[PDB]
Write a protein that binds this ligand. Structure first.
Ligand code: CD
Ligand code: CD
Ligand code: CD
Ligand code: CD
Ligand code: CD
Ligand code: CD
Ligand code: CD
Ligand code: CD
Ligand code: CD
Length: 102
């Protein structure tokens, strides 16, 4: 129940590479980047990618995490998701822990 995208809202051509070059040439993408490959390392942990997630109440991520399973519930509610997504809730949120809302 989500958009089938591997990109965010402003990815570089380096992200459009193959393999993804952001892990070689640096990352410069947006907070919506659904690319588990470039933003990894400085955002996640080996406990998050376990699928669904092994973090839960025992997280070991960085901060650039886009998962709402281990990240704490946003204060988004009643139109309080100013990033522009407008999820207004952690369950609807698909942003990261350092986004505009959070
Ligand atoms: Cd990207
Ligand atoms: Cd990428
Ligand atoms: Cd990137
Ligand atoms: Cd994570
Ligand atoms: Cd997680
Ligand atoms: Cd985590
Ligand atoms: Cd949020
Ligand atoms: Cd959101
Ligand atoms: Cd957001």
């Amino acid at each position: 129940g989500s958009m089938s995208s591997v990109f965010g809202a402003g990815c570089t051509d380096v992200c459009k590479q193959t393999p993804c070059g952001c892990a070689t040439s640096g990352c410069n993408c947006t907070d919506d980047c659904k690319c588990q490959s470039c933003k990894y390392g400085a955002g996640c942990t080996d406990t998050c990618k376990q699928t669904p997630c092994g973090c839960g109440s025992g997280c070991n991520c960085k901060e650039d995490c886009r998962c709402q399973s281990c990240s704490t519930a946003c204060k988004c509610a009643a139109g309080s998701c100013k990033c522009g997504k407008g999820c207004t809730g952690p369950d609807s949120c698909k942003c990261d822990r350092s986004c505009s809302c959070k």
